[PDB]
């Protein structure tokens, strides 16, 4: 893995590590899942940890997490993120596609908010957010 990919994964890990102690527990996984509006059962949480918990100590450390992310690789996370917004794959995020993502992520929206989000990101003034504008907005 490149250090840049390891740094992205470290940031991904840190989205789950609520106490910052360098391990992801079932409760930390379930917390994030609940925040996404999922309702995981104890069984599903344990099953997801079990596959990634290489040393069987009951929690996921960063090397175990990194091994899972590396297996996935076999695009950059900001690229995959853009693809989630750009559902029809034309390289541009439209208002409808942004509405779709906000809806899927439980972000309440209004047309004006959506227009202003697009307008703020829209450097070339074409009414949509392309990848380069996307990444600049995320900086």
């Amino acid at each position: 893995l490149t250090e840049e990919q390891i740094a992205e994964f470290k940031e991904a890990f840190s989205l789950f590590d609520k106490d910052g102690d360098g391990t992801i527990t079932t409760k930390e996984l379930g917390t994030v899942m609940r925040s996404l509006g999922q309702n995981p059962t104890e069984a599903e949480l344990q099953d997801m940890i079990i596959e990634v918990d290489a040393d069987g100590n009951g929690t996921i450390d960063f090397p175990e997490f990194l091994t899972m992310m590396a297996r996935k690789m076999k695009e950059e996370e900001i690229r995959e993120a853009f693809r989630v917004f750009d559902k029809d794959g034309n390289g541009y995020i439209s208002a409808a596609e942004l509405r779709h993502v906000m809806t899927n992520l439980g972000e309440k929206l209004t047309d004006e908010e959506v227009d202003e989000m697009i307008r703020e990101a829209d450097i070339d003034g074409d009414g949509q957010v392309n990848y380069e504008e996307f990444v600049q907005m995320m900086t």
């Binding site: 940031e11 990634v52 996370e77």
Partner: peptide
């Protein structure tokens, strides 16, 4: 400014994509 909303979507999407990775083993 709406940069915060954009950043919150990205954070959530990143979390959702890691959850999907756990689910896919």
């Amino acid at each position: 400014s709406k940069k915060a909303v954009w950043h919150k979507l990205l954070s959530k999407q990143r979390k959702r994509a890691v959850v999907a990775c756990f689910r896919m083993a």
